[PDB]
Nucleic acid binder design. Structure first.
Length: 235
RNA sequence: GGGGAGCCCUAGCACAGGUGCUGCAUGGCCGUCGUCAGCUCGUGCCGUGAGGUGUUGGGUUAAGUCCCGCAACGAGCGCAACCC
């Protein structure tokens, strides 16, 4: 458990595409690959999961932002289990902020769903229908986990918050708690709460994330087990 | 026996008429870039602002048509389909 899980398959990163304040977190910098300090990282994880279980047991959406394919795939399934409205595919400008507009985009999609199994299965012209198939598909292709986000979200979990500081950027201006997770690449004070840990390792993703999801399922009282994992991680 | 209206004539009078000018006074019809693929709106973000964003990258199509990107996502008059 904990620190010894890391001595297994995950640790520090960076070809020196780093960030100075994160280097205060840092131990060493050999191989060219910074030597993460997973100890005080365990301290961080302590405070992190404190608020995790708190806000989760009280109830209010933490906003799975995984985007890089790897992460994304795993997290998506995990997200479905985590119960939290989630960012699956490529994060697009508008979600965080243009909230009402988003609710409208949903409405177009959801009502496409509603009127996809209607007498429209009979009627309606070909070009209209077929095109509407296409854009219905893509609409759900992006707004899957987002389709279930309807009232002031209260923290995010995210992954590597540089890209996912496109994401941070938004929720950061939005006076909102943002947990989020990365290597010595990103920035510490860029975030509200910090998980200093590599995220190009698919296993790392699996482990820390399942830890969090289980933390929120234990906020409500339980904890089962994940389906997505070691599978496509290595094969 | 006149007187009444309409209708025709003759000098008068208001009046008309113009394929006479000027499209540097114009409507309208259009010739015309040219079926060129463009023109623009909503919110968010951006810049002190003008304004930007959208539409700035890459294919692809008849085409701003569609698709991967992208601080954005749509909607609009055209494009298309809708009349033959």
């Amino acid at each position: 458990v904990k620190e010894l899980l890391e001595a297994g398959v995950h640790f520090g990163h960076e070809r020196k595409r780093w960030n100075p304040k994160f280097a205060r977190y840092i131990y060493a910098e050999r191989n060219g690959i910074h030597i993460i300090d997973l100890q005080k990282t365990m301290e961080e994880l302590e405070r992190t999961f404190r608020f995790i279980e708190d806000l989760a047991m009280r109830g209010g959406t933490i906003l799975f932002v995984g985007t890089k394919k790897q992460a994304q795939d795993i997290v998506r399934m995990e997200a479905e289990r985590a119960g939290m409205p989630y960012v699956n595919q490529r994060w697009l400008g508008g979600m965080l902020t243009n909230f009402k507009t988003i609710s409208q985009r949903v409405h177009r999609l959801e009502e496409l769903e509603a009127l996809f199994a209607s007498p429209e299965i009979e009627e309606r012209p070909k070009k209209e229908q077929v095109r509407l198939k296409h854009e219905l598909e893509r609409l759900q292709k992006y707004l899957s986990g987002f389709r279930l986000l309807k009232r002031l979200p209260d923290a995010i979990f995210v992954v590597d918050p540089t890209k996912e500081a496109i994401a941070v950027r938004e929720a950061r201006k939005l006076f909102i708690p943002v947990i989020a997770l990365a290597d010595t690449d990103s920035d510490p004070d860029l975030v509200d709460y910090i998980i200093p840990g590599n995220d190009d390792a698919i296993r790392s993703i699996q482990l820390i994330l399942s830890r969090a999801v289980d933390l929120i399922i234990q906020a409500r009282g339980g904890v089962v087990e994940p389906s997505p994992s070691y599978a496509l991680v290595q094969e």
